[PDB]
Design a protein around this ligand. Structure first.
Ligand SMILES: COc1ccc2nccc(CC[C@H]3OC[C@H](NC(=O)c4ccc5c(c4)NC(=O)CO5)CO3)c2c1
Ligand SMILES: [Mn+2]
Ligand SMILES: [Mn+2]
Lengths: 673, 672
DNA sequence: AGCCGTAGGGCCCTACGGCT
DNA sequence: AGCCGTAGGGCCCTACGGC
């Protein structure tokens, strides 16, 4: 990995740590290879503050850093033996780079403290607006960042130790609550110089943490999506990949999304897209995949060069009226594109499909739900702001998993909908049945959500082999496209099969809990929310969307009647119209002449100058009158909706109801007492 | 291993499907009936056992997995009794690479498991085409077509004459290239049971002709392989021109993968990267931003990091592509159109050169100076009987991006005469003082295609293993600011020149370029000499300029015809408007306009599409200005089409301009 | 040898939080 | 104790021909 310098005189020698060979290459090409060494790492380095020492000392990248510095670790640490008097951290100028920087400072503080004391550690300052240093040309990387003349390094000073120790403990240690508190306390949500090592850690760390929270791992309460899923669906949309049209190569989709909207690795995008295609993961799948999109047995999808994809019908409902000023667009990562900040989301997607995400200081875990039940819930809520969770549960019985199965008891469900937290006990659907000669078997035909069917079956085998469960004489996955899931467990003759089943439910994922933890972005801040808040924020979104959409169609039909007004004047005075144009030299004079003569606006004048001659035929004259008369009718319909809060809300209901009628379906998961 | 066995054991009723990898595997595993159907994914191309020794075969993972899985052992240890399946089913992707992996698999079974074949246990599944690999198929469909024993069509492989079979495996898959080449030349055609010899011959031949005509060899006209052509056409169709800014590498590769080139990402991205390296291409076709590699054989950044567009001179490859200069063809799936060849307004085969390993043959064509090339083609255009020797008054010999030296003219001369020759390339190295009466060797240019770091390591090896006297140190002082610089310290009092000569004998510091000018001519491979290359090249240009002139003619005559309808209309504007105003439909207006004013359908249409702003005052006059300049152009064009000396001179003229704008100095020095 | 350059194909480290 | 899902990062086997 190391690409060393010529000079062995450590006095004048620098080593640069970079994230991988992609940056490595640019760095190598632009360095001064007499004084300047380069060590590429390989992504996130190990967190030494949370890891056992066995594996701190085995980890490659840790090891190689040790070798390169040649000073040994901890007690047996000779400053005098530093092969370099400058260790320069130069990760990418993105948030994951800030995080890899915190990880490294932690390693150095806890294993090479003197190195920091001695003033040998530094932080390079590459320009922003660059995914990694691999996107820079070597000359740029040199001028800006590496050239001893016209560059700016921060030298890491350690002031108070005690404070440093607490900081590393809080930020990087395994007590989440300490970290969570710091985030809350310091996050500001939207509506050779010395650098203190504590200052750097808290600023770098918070930068990462906030970024993961608002812009990675948590879904938005309004549309139920994380950034990656939003930019995927929105890309499908901008490229017209509707279900009527045909499937397009995943690589096209991914390439496009990566380029315009999502400056991150290919596999994060493709894997997100894949899940959205899996009817064992999504209760209402958002992508329609062609090819191998993986199995319940933990199989990956085929590589993105093989598969293809489009929207499902129901994703249309997520995107409807996105170009009717329903929702605010923002700048993409680099200035050159516009992306939606949220989707219209005309059905309640946060709950329908659920969410899961590991952030920093917190996580989220929201189960999926029956859409017929959810919309009935939003209906009841719309007729009654003061409805209770108990009343809402009259409609929303509890979660509805794609994989079906059983939930045991209404009581975890109730806590989760009331507090935002609760454990939910899920079981497989298993029956006991004769197989012949007075012997029996267990048949599992549905397994709990998020359980790998293979791993589950291996577990049972590994219980039968470690002689750790009695009575089982065979185990077979008879699952098949033709017959559905079907896992068979033969039972020894005369053994009690019900007992064996209970044993499996105790000792295998045949029974599994689901720990609800309903954190989402509300005003782009993380909040633990109950069932009713989820539906309130959802309905508040829908109200705004149907209002803005109605306001937009008004401005637009008004703009258009205005033009049809110019054109009807034209048709009534066509001879004089022709005359005015013919007697004009420029287009500028005609425009002025038509405004004055016939009291037309600039826009009308221009639309008349744009009329083609074929529009003076019989049918074309009629269409202009017809389009105009239909449009006045529509304009006054729109005005009705905007002048009356109750007609608007009634529209919201009628629309929800239509979606419930077209996409609603049976409950799959049975909830038992 | 990723073996997914079935649940039954008795092999009489159990089958195993071999597929290319896990993408195919998953569709196969979700599709299959797992009571009787095992699946074993491989990993792409398997080893050719006909060309490998036994130590290597038995180290190979995929080979091992197959042996284990089948349970018969191999060779004389073979045993039909211990078969775990009575049907072994080869199910590779429905493409040419899948024919090839079929031939490799059958080569393994015939040489190590022949009784398996003698006994009827081997089979070939028949998936549908249209799908890159099985990973693009849904499991329901792969079940119906291919795997379900009530529907599928299986071929059962049969051995007849074992002597013929031996000859075939030997010829097709053995180490002797020439019999294979001969079999290709003899069988190629350019523009229930299955005999194993027929399968081998037909599957291999497919593969072979696919690599030859459509992978590894350049076209003589444009100097390009399918992958480079599709990339450049891609850049163009998305206007990624040099005036515009850079697009993202992943977008470009994604575009091209979908539209034109159904193959792995890395083949595309790597082809693009090389086109951007100024140490690889004498005249780079791609302009890249980010890490695109080094002479030390670092690869580019991954494609999420880099951006790219055309270079100035690529516009010249593409100039006039829209003027019917070249025949477009269907892409691989029917939903696109691609160029079969580029206009190529400079001679790109010899300019940037080409190297490719095919089947039965290879190509290796060095790069050249463009100022020289062009003077060459001009000279040829003044004299169809120009000799190689006269041609070499312009074209001194290869000119490499990396500069350096060529020793003597005799390899050059042989190469240009016959299309084969060996050319000795040598570093640019000087000897210089370093202080205290010591000296060093400074190397500042290295041969084409010689990895600099790997070369420095071969020098270290010699010093370490004491096969060279007198070297005390070795350093790469290469930098952006300094250019290539490799220093070799010599021991006080040792003769530096001697040392340097040893380095030339013993290191890539001197390297042969083995010229072997194979290219496609009417899409068939041909060994061509210097002159035959320039001639095909000149022929393409004349065709281009002629087809270009024919196109502008059709187009200017079409436009004149429109303008003759517009003249009539502006001159009769009222009767025109009444004619229309009186007409119920757009149809009736066309008919009336046409009867009353002697107009064609297309003249009537142009009038009906006329906007009212065209009736302003100075428009009857513009139409007339335009129309008179059109008639002038029309005849300027007819001049050209009727006199071949005028067309040829036109060709000469455009080339001279390209020479003036893009021609640069020779970099490689030719020492005699 | 083993390397040139288009082709087939796939695997494994790391962070992060909460549940087992 | 190790999985789940967005994220950071990269490597190594194969065919082909010519020297
Ligand atoms: C399969 O299993 C193995 C296992 C062993 C391996 N050892 C080392 C490295 C790897 C893979 C690392 C490599 O890095 C670059 C990756 N792709 C991109 O950067 C990229 C970005 C955007 C894109 C595309 C690609 N593809 C498009 O068509 C457009 O959108 C491709 O994968 C290995 C792979
Ligand atoms: Mn990075
Ligand atoms: Mn394949």
């Amino acid at each position: 990995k190391l690409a060393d310098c010529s000079s062995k005189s450590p006095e004048e020698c620098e080593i640069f740590l970079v994230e991988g060979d992609s940056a490595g290459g640019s760095t190598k090409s632009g360095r001064d290879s007499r004084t300047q060494a380069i060590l590429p790492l390989r992504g996130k380095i190990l967190n030494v503050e949370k890891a056992r020492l066995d594996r701190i000392l085995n980890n490659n990248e840790i090891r190689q850093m040790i070798t390169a510095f040649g000073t040994g670790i901890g007690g047996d640490f000779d400053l005098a033996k530093a092969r370099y008097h400058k260790i320069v951290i130069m990760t990418d100028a993105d948030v994951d780079g800030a995080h890899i920087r915190t990880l490294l400072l932690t390693f150095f503080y806890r294993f090479m403290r003197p190195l920091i004391e001695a003033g040998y550690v530094y932080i390079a300052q590459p320009p922003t607006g660059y995914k990694g240093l691999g996107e820079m040309n070597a000359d740029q990387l040199w001028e800006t960042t590496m050239n001893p003349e016209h560059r700016a390094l921060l030298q890491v000073k350690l002031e108070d130790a005690i404070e440093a120790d607490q900081t590393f403990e809080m930020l990087m240690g395994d007590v989440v609550e300490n970290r969570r508190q710091f985030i809350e306390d310091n996050a500001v949500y939207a509506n050779i110089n010395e650098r203190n090592i504590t200052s750097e850690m808290r600023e770098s760390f918070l930068d990462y943490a906030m970024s993961v929270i608002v812009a990675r791992a948590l879904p938005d309460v309004r549309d139920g999506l994380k950034p990656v899923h939003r930019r995927i669906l929105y890309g499908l949309n901008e490229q017209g990949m509707t279900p009527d049209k045909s499937y397009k190569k995943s690589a096209r989709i991914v390439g496009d999304v990566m380029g315009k909207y999502h400056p991150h690795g290919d596999s994060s995008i493709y894997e997100a897209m894949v899940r959205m295609a899996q009817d064992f993961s999504y209760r209402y799948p958002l992508v329609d995949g062609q090819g191998n999109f993986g199995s319940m047995d933990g199989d990956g999808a085929a590589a993105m060069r093989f598969t293809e994809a489009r929207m499902t019908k129901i994703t249309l409902e997520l995107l409807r009226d996105i170009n009717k000023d329903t929702i605010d667009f923002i700048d993409n990562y680099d200035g050159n594109e516009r992306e939606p900040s949220v989707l219209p989301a005309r059905f309640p997607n946060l709950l329908a499909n659920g969410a899961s995400g590991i952030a920093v200081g917190m996580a989220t875990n929201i189960p999926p739900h029956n859409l017929t039940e959810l919309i009935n819930g939003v209906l009841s809520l719309s007729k009654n702001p003061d409805i209770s969770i108990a009343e809402l549960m009259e409609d929303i019985e509890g979660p509805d998993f794609p994989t079906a199965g059983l939930i045991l008891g209404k009581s975890g469900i109730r806590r989760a909908y009331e507090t935002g937290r609760g454990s939910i006990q899920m079981r497989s659907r298993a029956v006991i049945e004769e197989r012949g000669g007075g012997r029996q078997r267990i048949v599992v035909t549905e397994i709990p959500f998020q359980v790998n069917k293979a791993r589950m079956i291996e577990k049972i085998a590994e219980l039968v082999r470690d002689k750790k469960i009695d009575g089982i004489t065979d185990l077979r996955d008879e699952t098949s496209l033709r017959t559905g899931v079907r896992v068979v467990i033969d039972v020894r003759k005369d053994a009690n099969a019900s007992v064996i089943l209970n044993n499996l439910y105790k000792q295998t994922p045949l029974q599994t809990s689901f720990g609800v933890n309903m954190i989402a972005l509300v005003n782009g801040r993380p909040k633990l929310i109950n069932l009713k808040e989820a539906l309130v924020h959802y309905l508040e979104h829908q109200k705004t969307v149907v209002r803005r959409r109605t306001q937009y169609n008004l401005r637009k039909a008004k703009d258009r009647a205005h033009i049809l007004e110019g054109l009807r004047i034209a048709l009534d005075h066509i001879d004089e119209i022709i005359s005015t144009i013919r007697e004009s030299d420029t287009d500028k004079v005609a425009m002025e002449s038509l405004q004055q003569r016939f009291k037309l606006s600039e826009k009308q004048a221009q639309a008349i100058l744009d009329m083609r001659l074929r529009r003076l035929t019989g049918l074309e004259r009629d269409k202009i009158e017809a389009e105009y008369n239909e449009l006045l009718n529509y304009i006054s319909e729109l005005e009705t909706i905007l002048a009356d809060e109750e007609v608007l809300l009634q529209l919201v209901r009628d629309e929800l109801t239509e979606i419930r009628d077209r996409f609603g379906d049976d409950r799959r998961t049975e909830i038992q007492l």
